[PDB]
């Protein structure tokens, strides 16, 4: 049997690789926040706790589950089985309520801007996270570890490992409704109000100008400099015709409004001088003209202040990675209520692993898309 042996070797290598990636990715996130004060924001306190739960899944949950399935039975005894099940459900429950914290915290920043942001400190973020881990422990740990003593008998036979009060299929489904389906519904409606609040005009023109200015700096060919120069110049004219939040509410004839438009008139003059050199053949000099643009922009940035579009996109990615990876297991629980043979044990293992995969791809939802995390990752990996 040369094939059944290769499947075991393939599974061990794939499981060990996923566990290793989950460990490294989440440690890099947690260490980056600790060593860089620029990453010590309220949002990253919630991501630190999220990466903290993902690290426990990669270290304990993934490895103990791989040993369980490869050997074919539970070899570590009943005590370690209860501790593993309790740790798995508490850490998972803390993740779900962590996503609820991120969703509600973002909801009150767009619906209560005159009240909530001033109440949004790292001490409040630490208390909400601490309360989430305490509530998760109280909900799952005593029931998983001590239900056998309440009923007075341990029905989990030797070599088996499962939650004892889940012997009733309807009980498992009620758990799926309260611990997964209801939270996902809440996070979906919360995001629906987030994207509708994002869907005012001054932030859209200034963000387009700054984003296309970076594209010129890191452009590989001549098509990326032409598209960025035109789309930025279009956004610069729409940002010039509008009035910024100026002090004292000054008329268009004021020296503040005249010099504000004059700052954009200098920028368009340098943009067309960069567009010229890009067509003369000095595409490298047009990229050197972007530094002159960044100087003029910085010389007249005192009239303006938004990365909130990226923040909303980041939350959606974190929520979708949670829904997509945890949905297959929960529909198996639903089908299990009326047809247990409809879900083979191989399908159960796959659905259980997909939930673990949520911890693997979670850092890639935000860390590999944020400019500050990338710079800190490079610094953590270079040899001093």
Ligand X SMILES: C[N+]1(C)[C@@H]2C[C@@H](OC(=O)[C@H](CO)c3ccccc3)C[C@H]1[C@@H]1O[C@@H]12
Q: Is 175 in the site for ligand X (CB under 6 A)?
A: yes
Q: Give CA–CA dist 98/183, Å, rounded.
A: 11
φ, ψ of residue 94 in degrees (nearest 5) = -65, -35
User: Binder to Hg ion among 23, 51, 52, 163 (CB under 5 A)?
Assistant: 52
Interface region with Hg ion, contact rule CB under 5 A, candidates 50-58, 115-123, 146-154, 299-307 = 50-58
Sign of CA dihedral 31, 97, 365, 333: positive
Query: CA–CA distance from 218 to each of 87, 104, 280 (Å)?
Result: 45, 36, 20
- Provide Rg for the chain, Cα atoms: 27
Tell the smallest beta-carbon distance from residue 326 to Hg ion (Å).
14
Tell the smallest beta-carbon distance from residue 276 to ligand X (Å).
59
User: Binder to ligand X among 43, 66, 212, 330 (CB under 6 A)?
Assistant: 330
Query: CA–CA distance from 198 to each of 207, 209, 240, 307 (Å)?
Result: 14, 19, 22, 11
User: Binder to ligand X among 23, 99, 321, 355 (CB under 6 A)?
Assistant: 355
Tokens 């791809």 belong to residue: 361
User: Binder to ligand X among 18, 179, 216, 278 (CB under 6 A)?
Assistant: 179
The site map against Hg ion for 303-322 (x = CB under 5 A) is ------------------x-
Q: Which is nearer to ligand X, 185 or 299 (CB)?
A: 185
User: Binder to ligand X among 326, 366, 373, 377 (CB under 6 A)?
Assistant: 326
Q: Which is nearer to ligand X, 92 or 312 (CB)?
A: 92
353 binds, among Hg ion, ligand X, none (CB under 5 to 8 A by kind): none
Q: Give CA–CA dist 250/303, Å, rounded.
A: 13
Q: Give 133-155 as a DSSP string.
A: HHHHHHHHHHHHHHHHHHHT---
Q: Give CA–CA dist 287/216, Å, rounded.
A: 6
Helix axes 182-198, 78-111, angle to 10 degrees: 30
Q: Is 88 in the site for ligand X (CB under 6 A)?
A: yes
Count residues contacting Hg ion (CB under 5 A)?
Answer: 6
52 binds, among ligand X, Hg ion, none (CB under 5 to 8 A by kind): Hg ion
Sign of CA dihedral 73, 358, 96, 59: positive
Q: Which is nearer to ligand X, 19 or 208 (CB)?
A: 19
> Using an 8 Å Cβ cutoff, are 233 and 225 in contact?
no
3-state secondary structure (DSSP) of residue 162: coil
Q: Give CA–CA dist 92/262, Å, rounded.
A: 56
Interface region with Hg ion, contact rule CB under 5 A, candidates 54-62, 109-117, 281-289, 295-303 = 54-62
Q: Which residues have C-beta within 8 Å of that of residue 283, sequence separation ≥ 6?
A: 222, 225, 277
Site for ligand X, residues 302 to 321, rule: CB under 6 A: none
The site map against Hg ion for 325-364 (x = CB under 5 A) is ------------------------------------x--x
The site map against ligand X for 189-208 (x = CB under 6 A) is --------------------
361 binds, among ligand X, Hg ion, none (CB under 5 to 8 A by kind): Hg ion
Residues that bind ligand X (CB under 6 A): 61, 88-89, 92-93, 96, 175-176, 179-180, 326, 329-330, 333, 352, 355
Residues that bind Hg ion (CB under 5 A): 52, 55, 321, 361, 364-365
């Amino acid at each position: 049997s040369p094939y059944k042996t290769f499947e075991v070797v393939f599974i061990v290598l794939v499981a060990g690789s996923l566990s290793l990636v989950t460990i490294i990715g989440n440690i890099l996130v947690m260490v980056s926040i600790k060593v860089n004060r620029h990453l010590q924001t309220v949002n990253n306190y919630f991501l630190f706790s999220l990466a903290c739960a993902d690290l426990i899944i990669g270290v304990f949950s993934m490895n103990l589950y791989t040993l369980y399935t490869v050997i074919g039975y539970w070899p570590l005894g009943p005590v370690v089985c209860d501790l593993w099940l309790a740790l798995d459900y508490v850490v998972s429950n803390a993740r779900v309520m962590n996503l609820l914290i991120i969703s509600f915290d973002r909801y009150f920043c767009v619906t209560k801007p005159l009240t909530y942001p001033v109440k949004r400190t790292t001490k409040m973020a630490g208390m909400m996270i601490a309360a989430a881990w305490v509530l998760s422990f109280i909900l799952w740990a005593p029931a998983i570890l001590f239900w056998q003593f309440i009923v007075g008998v341990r029905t989990v036979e030797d070599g088996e490992c499962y939650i004892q009060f889940f012997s009733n299929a309807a009980v498992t489904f009620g758990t799926a409704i309260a611990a997964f389906y209801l939270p996902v519904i809440i996070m979906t409606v919360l995001y629906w109000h987030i994207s509708r609040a994002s869907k005012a005009d001054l932030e859209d023109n200034w963000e387009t100008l700054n984003d296309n200015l970076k594209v010129i700096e890191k452009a590989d060919n001549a098509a990326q400099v032409k598209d960025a120069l035109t789309k930025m110049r279009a956004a610069a004219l729409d940002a010039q015709k509008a009035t910024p939040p100026k002090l004292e509410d000054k008329s268009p004839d004021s020296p503040e409004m005249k010099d504000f438009r004059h700052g954009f008139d200098i920028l368009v003059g340098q943009i067309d001088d960069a567009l010229k050199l890009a067509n003369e053949g000095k595409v490298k000099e047009a990229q050197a003209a972007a530094e002159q643009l960044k100087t003029t922009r910085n010389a007249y940035i005192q009239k303006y202040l938004s990365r909130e579009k990226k923040v909303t996109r980041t939350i959606l990615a974190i929520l979708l990675a949670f829904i997509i990876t945890w949905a297959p297991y929960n529909v198996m629980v639903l089908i299990n209520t009326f047809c247990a043979p409809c879900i083979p044990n191989t399908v159960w293992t796959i659905g259980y692993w997909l939930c673990y995969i949520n911890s693997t791809i979670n850092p890639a939802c935000y860390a590999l898309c944020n400019a500050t995390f990338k710079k800190t990752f490079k610094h953590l990996l270079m040899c001093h």
